[PDB]
Amino acid sequence: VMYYGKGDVFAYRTYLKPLTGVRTIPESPFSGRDHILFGVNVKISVGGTKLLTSFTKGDNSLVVATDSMKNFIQKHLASYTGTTIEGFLEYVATSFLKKYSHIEKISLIGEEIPFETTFAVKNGNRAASELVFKKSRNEYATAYLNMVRNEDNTLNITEQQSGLAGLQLIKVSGNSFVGFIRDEYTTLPEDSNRPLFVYLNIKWKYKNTEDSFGTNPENYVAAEQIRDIATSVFHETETLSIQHLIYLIGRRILERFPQLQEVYFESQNHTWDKIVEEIPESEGKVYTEPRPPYGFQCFTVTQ
Amino acid sequence: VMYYGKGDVFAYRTYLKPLTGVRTIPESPFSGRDHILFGVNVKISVGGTKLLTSFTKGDNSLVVATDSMKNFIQKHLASYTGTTIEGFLEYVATSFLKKYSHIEKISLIGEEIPFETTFAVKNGNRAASELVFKKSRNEYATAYLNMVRNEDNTLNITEQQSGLAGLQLIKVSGNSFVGFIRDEYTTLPEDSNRPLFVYLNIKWKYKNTEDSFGTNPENYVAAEQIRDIATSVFHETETLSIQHLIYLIGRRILERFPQLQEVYFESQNHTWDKIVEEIPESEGKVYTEPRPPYGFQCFTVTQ
């Protein structure tokens, strides 16, 4: 293994070209992105056999300073004329390999830094502000891209993946976990109605990488839309386990977006422990946080 | 100083009585709380001279186990019939002092654990789910209450405070910071148009503590409404500093809620450093995260 790069390259751009012309789905009102504020956290990794002596001999002759990669990323966000994190990564990668001929491979991660709208009164009415936004520490979109230079100096994308990270969903009822193995290691009680609490990271891959860029936006799959599928399927489903849930979410995603090849899930169980099962004159209950150990599932659904 | 207690007492209740009948303000659509899910993180501190020997002699005869205070809090959330964190704290405090006659003072903090609604399709339409909610790691409401037992065994509230914590607001333009002291310690440039980024914790105190409980909900001041005042004033104001901003927010709060005695602000500056000032054929710019040191302000506005 041999690579190096720069992490936590935060870059905030105002007034990126808006994302419009997207194709809608029943589960989501998503219709585009205003891009008044477009925030991204970028990680860049680069490799190539010509970097060996930077490690083995301390020769920096062919070392692009990681500080310079930070400058490269932030300057290119200024000159980017597209509309997606996916397309920004392609722009950075192609530009970087064109600039640095001795680099053979580049890998990029971009993580959205999301901002939400806020209310303001003006000119007689209250409406969403075009100026004041709220930084969100909840779920966020992600993008990943790897690009290589071939022997003939052409550049090729070798992997692309989009995603939604940090989605934390609790469904208060309509979930069971029963019928699992009950042996000498089992102390979990069967539960016909638990408040299942899942953390979800959902990643998708396109059949055709061009559809990830937003250039023909009707072919773009938006993380907002993926979020809303996940919440809708969770609501619709009398869940039998997280495993059961995530497969159903993945099936719906691939049905809604035939241009996707597959969807991958990383789920975690964070379901609360129950403290009060019955409350006089109410269907309510009381729960609290569990001990630290958390279940998890990793699963791919393909077309 | 002598007290002890329990922190991070998470308690989640389903189907608390809804909060309705509130009085509206121009800055906010807030009209109440459904309370399908009501989550609170409680810290309890207790004191009293009769606790001395628990420290000086290792005598636990009069020690309420902190583990038992956790049970006390979680059981009382089950039996609570009111509609606010403020009222829940009063219920816990009065109940605890009534139960433990040797305790002379109790202090409680309650922090909302907020959940947001999500979309689901069902019966032909898409609408907010009554079952699936999204845990939010953004701003949250807070409540504080201190209660004492008097020599005659009556109980009195000695301090009450409500709040909104963790509000992170960025306004992309319409903010200046110019005219500050420029001496041998000054390297900050004057800036006539910066993207001011503030973290805000806003705390308010009522003229009459009863108005905090929600029993007559038209007198309750909701953290949601305070949030929307803050965003509206930020939008409306050509800010001259954070100091200038927070005073204006506080004035609006006290004008909208004459039943409040004062409002207190803890603000932090997290404004990004500018990297690209000019972008061809665009009003946009590029910024990035600053170094760690952060400015802050603490200020009270009173009626």
Added chain:
Amino acid sequence: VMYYGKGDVFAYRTYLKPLTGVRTIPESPFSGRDHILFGVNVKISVGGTKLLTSFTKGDNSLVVATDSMKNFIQKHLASYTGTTIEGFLEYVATSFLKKYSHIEKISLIGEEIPFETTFAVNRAASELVFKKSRNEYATAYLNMVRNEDNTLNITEQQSGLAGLQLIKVSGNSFVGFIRDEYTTLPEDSNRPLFVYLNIKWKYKNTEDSFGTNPENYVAAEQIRDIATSVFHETETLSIQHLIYLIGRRILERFPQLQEVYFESQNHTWDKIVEEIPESEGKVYTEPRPPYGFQCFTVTQ
């Protein structure tokens, strides 16, 4: 309330004047600080009635920028000729009030950023390579005011140790507490008590905190080692009982101190396996999040 300032002012100084000549105590090997690397995280807060219009009118005429406060602190760490965080805070405080006549009060916190020695090869401690520690760290607090007669006065000073996490595998009990409708906790005659400790002390004479007479300076390193020694020596009956005895020992070792203040938290593990064949050992695991805490002052 009306004040403003700057937090997370990190400053790292190499080769500060070493702290030498400190009085040692039985419990600790501490005898000074080499100060090859001196790291401190400073927070400054300033007040004054003349700041009012910076809020009420947006007038920045009398605003020292918080960014400039950061420069002030960093430049003063370069010119500081002393040997303690406590003394550095006094230097900053006096310099700032002398510079800015419209400021009536200044509050400072300094938190050590600790670095530990490492081995380099015969093996010996390196004088160049250090290990950044995320464990316990020393702290200092100072509040200084301008009086009506233009004299400057320290109104409060406090040193401390923060982030000390100690677990004693045996020799701790918690029994005899109240058992009623809300008590589910079992009594335990031998628990592996795990405590987090923040310990703070005040001097009888604020000058002793500066280190100018090193014999009268109380080092957070020595407080740490007192706490571990007393924990080891004591068959604890509760955290309350433990911290009282720690405080008593500190005050006995440092008669120049007026008080010791404790903030403790209980993080004891849940026991899962009570008996292991042919062993005295047990298996424990992490508890649920709720944590007990205590706050207590011992006075000289």
Added chain:
Amino acid sequence: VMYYGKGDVFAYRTYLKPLTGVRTIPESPFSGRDHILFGVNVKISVGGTKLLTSFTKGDNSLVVATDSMKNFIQKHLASYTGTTIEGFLEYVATSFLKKYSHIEKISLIGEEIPFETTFAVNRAASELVFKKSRNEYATAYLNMVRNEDNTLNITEQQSGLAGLQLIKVSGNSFVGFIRDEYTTLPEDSNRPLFVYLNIKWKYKNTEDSFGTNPENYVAAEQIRDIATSVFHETETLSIQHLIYLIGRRILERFPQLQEVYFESQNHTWDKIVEEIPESEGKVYTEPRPPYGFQCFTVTQ
């Protein structure tokens, strides 16, 4: 991909069999582990084609509950008769596949929860009181599969040290790098290089990782001390240059290792004061968030 499991399975064992008889090296005083307190955080992941319907149909017939996996790991720490995290992982892996015939693969991570000795009073290290450390910690990884012939086989094993944060105040340069339209970084012939290191190693013979023959076990404590020694000895020309030399030294000291893998990060401070009167010292501060990193393998 199809697997599931349990993370953050904390388990603390008192009085595990001590690790004795380890081979020492010049760079480290390490010679064994008392194991009065043995803390490990385990993550388990399991796979098998027969799990498919637990996803596609909601059939829990063949689901070992992740909660039960937690019980499995904790109970096996109580019955473990060995002396290393690496060996404990092998014990868990083999036991789990032997128990559950429908599981075809198991992956385990174990992360040490480290505790340091403290002083108790003559002053001496306590045998009861320990300090929880949030600094560097040892790690272990193991993957085991069931073959078509029902034999069990370890397909991957890796030990490591994580979270090592080292700063060398002088004796480091970074010069000669590419200078073009994107380069603003100044060359530096004497910088206080601050690196975070995660170091991982693989054995030629997976059995050497278990500790059964302690002479062949490579301790994370010894890797730590090699890293600090090499850092001290080397006039570094970059982090790339440093980690190569660290790797070479590790492989020279432990011929039983096949490779050493590094993940490093640059956290060097920005310099604010270049010269202080009558001192060799300087003042630095924390940089902006973006951090450089390197990843490199050295092979025997």
